[PDB]
Each structure stands twice: as structure tokens, then as C-alpha cells.
Design a binder for this molecule. Structure first.
Ligand code: HEM
Length: 145
């Protein structure tokens, strides 16, 4: 049910993953400035210059596309999410807490831009909690605790 609740508001997100993606990463770097150093391609860009940066928006689209693919998948999740844990722990070196930060940014962006109401916000927090718990478990399998 919670996946369906999010999907009832996903139209404006998938309509323009680049614009919405840029809003998400811009807001992440604004509100949680310590996250910006986790993207070496973007670390050091003055905050005022992020909203208009096309590469930031393209990278925001990547996360939103993958979340959409996690919402619409008819086969194994687990198979979509294990590779994500692997790359984020071993290649990108992203501490787990950062996933909670980006999830809360997305909740707020969807409230503002995608009509996600109180119940939908709870549903999205539940979905993101499922995802984050799986990432955390897979991180631990790799030795990250
Ligand atoms: C559930 C949340 C997230 C999803 C679905 C997601 C998804 C992705 C995907 C699909 C890629 C490209 C393929 C790969 O390398 O695995 C990627 C790359 C990356 N992600 Fe994430 N990500 C998430 C959260 C984060 C967070 C919280 C950060 C840092 C705050 C982060 C930082 C990165 C970086 C640095 C890359 C590499 C970008 C590049 O190659 O320039 N991701 N992510």
C-alpha cells in the first residue's frame, strides 16, 4: 500500500526527473552542507551556483530514476538494492545517515511539487525506511557498521 501511495504522486516527479532532481540535490547541499563533499564533482561549488548547474540536476535525476524503478519493479527488490549498497559503501563511500537526509529532502520536495499530503509523506518515509534498512544491512555484510 505505501508503494502505491507514493506512486499516486509520482507523476510530476517522473515528468521531469532533471528539474526535480536538481531541486533535491540543491536542497540537500543547502540544508546539509556536509553532504556536498561526498560528491567530488560538486564539492566546493558555491551554494548560489548549484540551482542552475545542469550536471547537479542530471545527478539528481539518477537518484529519482532509481527510486522510480524501486517503486515499479515487479521482480526482486533485493536485486535492485544490493548493487546500490555495494557501490555506495565501496566506491562512493557514503555513510548510511546520509540516506536519511536525502529521503527527508525528497519528502519535502514532493510535498511542495507533487501534491504529497500527510498520509503520502508517511508512506514515503516508510518506503525510504525499507530502502535504508536494506542498505544498512548490506553495508554490514561488507564490513561497514
Ligand atoms: C536511496 C537513495 C539513493 C539512491 C537510489 C542512489 C542511486 C544512485 C545511482 C543509481 C547511482 C549511479 C550508479 C551507482 O554508482 O550505484 C548513484 C551514484 C552516486 N551516488 Fe547515490 N543514491 C542514493 C543516495 C545517495 C546519497 C545519500 C549520496 C550522498 C549524499 C549519494 C552519492 C552518490 C555518488 C557520489 C554517486 C556517484 C556519482 C558520480 O559518478 O559522479 N547517493 N547513486
Amino acid at each position: 500500500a505505501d508503494f502505491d501511495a507514493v506512486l499516486k504522486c509520482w507523476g510530476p516527479v517522473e515528468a521531469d526527473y532533471t528539474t526535480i532532481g536538481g531541486l533535491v540535490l540543491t536542497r540537500l547541499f543547502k540544508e546539509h552542507p556536509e553532504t556536498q563533499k561526498l560528491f567530488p564533482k560538486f564539492a566546493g561549488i558555491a551554494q548560489a551556483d548549484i540551482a542552475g548547474n545542469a550536471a547537479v540536476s542530471a545527478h539528481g535525476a539518477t537518484v529519482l530514476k532509481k527510486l522510480g524503478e524501486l517503486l515499479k519493479a515487479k521482480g526482486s527488490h533485493a536485486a535492485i538494492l544490493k548493487p546500490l549498497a555495494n557501490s555506495h559503501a565501496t566506491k562512493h563511500k557514503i555513510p548510511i545517515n546520509n540516506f536519511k537526509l536525502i529521503s527527508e529532502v525528497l519528502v519535502k520536495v514532493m510535498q511542495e511539487k507533487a501534491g504529497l499530503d500527510a498520509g503520502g509523506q508517511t508512506a514515503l518515509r516508510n518506503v525510504m525506511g525499507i530502502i535504508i534498512a536494506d542498505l544498512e544491512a548490506n553495508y554490514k555484510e561488507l564490513g561497514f557498521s
